[PDB]
């Protein structure tokens, strides 16, 4: 895409505010701008309501479904910055999302090496599926093509997320919870949900660890990984932009000051290092467990 057309979409220019030379790059068609507005938004996993796309595309929920579809098709990372919409709205968790990517590359016999790096890291972290586990599952898949009961990826993939590392300072958020959903809950699990529903989002340390991991396994909660402008983050070392913002940083510095130096927009950098922390690629410094508030299961 024209870097300039994109510049204008990013900064949310309506059509009329557009330079006629950028209007020239769109064949002077407004509808072509709108087409590239949806495109760029979907590709950059833009939040619907804060963005030009809300004016072109009329159904929000359909914008998010198309967003998730594109993200899955291009093997992108889960849009953790849209977890509220994806989980609460489309009822699709990180785990669900990656399950779909796994199913796609297995059922179509693609290589685990076709998965981008962070995507594969997140598949390992959520499905327990690294390259080796994937080689094993793939073989099971091809092996069972000889037996009367064939298997496809759905038959092999996990049906719940493996245990994930969860920092105490991660924030727990209530998913979309139905009555039948709770009908499967424990009472400590219900205690947590009602806490979150009443008091709002909850620091994860504040809750029972086993209720957090079990709600998380049911998909009844999702995790926010807070990154603020004052946040300082450290990196142990061992599209391509994420792998490039990643190598490019440490600098013993603020995140906002990390955005400026990096000359990449800040909101996009807060999201990216929230993602790096979540996945174990970056380490949010200054975190401090107050053991008087830490629930005892931790």
């Amino acid at each position: 895409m024209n870097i300039d057309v994109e510049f204008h979409i990013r900064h949310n220019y309506p059509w009329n505010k557009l330079p006629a030379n950028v209007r020239q790059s769109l064949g002077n068609s407004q509808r072509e701008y709108e087409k590239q507005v949806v495109l760029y938004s979907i590709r950059n996993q833009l939040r619907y309501r804060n963005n030009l796309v809300k004016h072109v595309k009329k159904d929000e929920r359909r914008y998010y479904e198309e967003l998730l579809k594109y993200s899955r098709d291009h093997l992108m990372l889960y849009p953790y910055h849209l977890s509220d919409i994806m989980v609460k709205g489309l009822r699709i968790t990180p785990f669900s999302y990656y399950t779909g990517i796994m199913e796609d590359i297995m059922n179509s016999e693609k290589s685990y090496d076709s998965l981008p790096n962070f995507t594969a890291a997140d598949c390992l972290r959520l499905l327990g599926i690294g390259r080796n586990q994937y080689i094993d599952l793939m073989n099971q898949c091809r092996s069972s093509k000889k037996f009367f009961r064939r298997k496809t990826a759905r038959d092999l993939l996990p049906i719940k997320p493996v245990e994930i590392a969860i920092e105490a300072w991660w924030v727990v958020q209530a998913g979309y919870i139905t009555e039948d959903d709770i009908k499967i809950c424990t009472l400590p699990e219900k205690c947590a949900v009602d806490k979150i529903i009443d008091s709002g989002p909850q620091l994860s340390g504040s809750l029972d660890y086993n209720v957090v991991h079990s709600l998380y396994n049911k998909g009844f909660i999702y995790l926010d990984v807070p990154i603020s402008d004052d946040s300082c983050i450290a990196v142990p070392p061992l599209e391509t932009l994420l792998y490039k913002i990643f190598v490019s940083i440490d600098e013993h510095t603020n995140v906002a000051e990390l955005a400026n130096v990096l000359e990449i927009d800040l909101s996009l950098v807060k999201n990216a290092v929230s993602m790096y922390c979540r996945l174990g690629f970056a380490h949010k410094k200054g975190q401090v467990i107050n053991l008087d508030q830490l629930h005892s299961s931790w």
């Binding site: 929000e60 929920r61 509220d84 919409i85 609460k88 709205g89 489309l90 009822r91 699709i92 968790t93 785990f95 669900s96 049906i159 719940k160 997320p161 209530a174 998913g175 979309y176 919870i177 139905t178 009555e179 039948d180 959903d181 709770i182 499967i184 949900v193 009602d194 529903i197 396994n217 049911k218 998909g219 009844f220």
Partner: peptide
């Protein structure tokens, strides 16, 4: 079991309003 996008959307627990209508 895990939540599924195929699941039927029932009533919202405690009348918490959806992201979507």
């Amino acid at each position: 079991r895990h939540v599924s996008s195929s699941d039927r959307v029932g009533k919202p627990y405690r009348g918490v309003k959806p992201v979507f209508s």
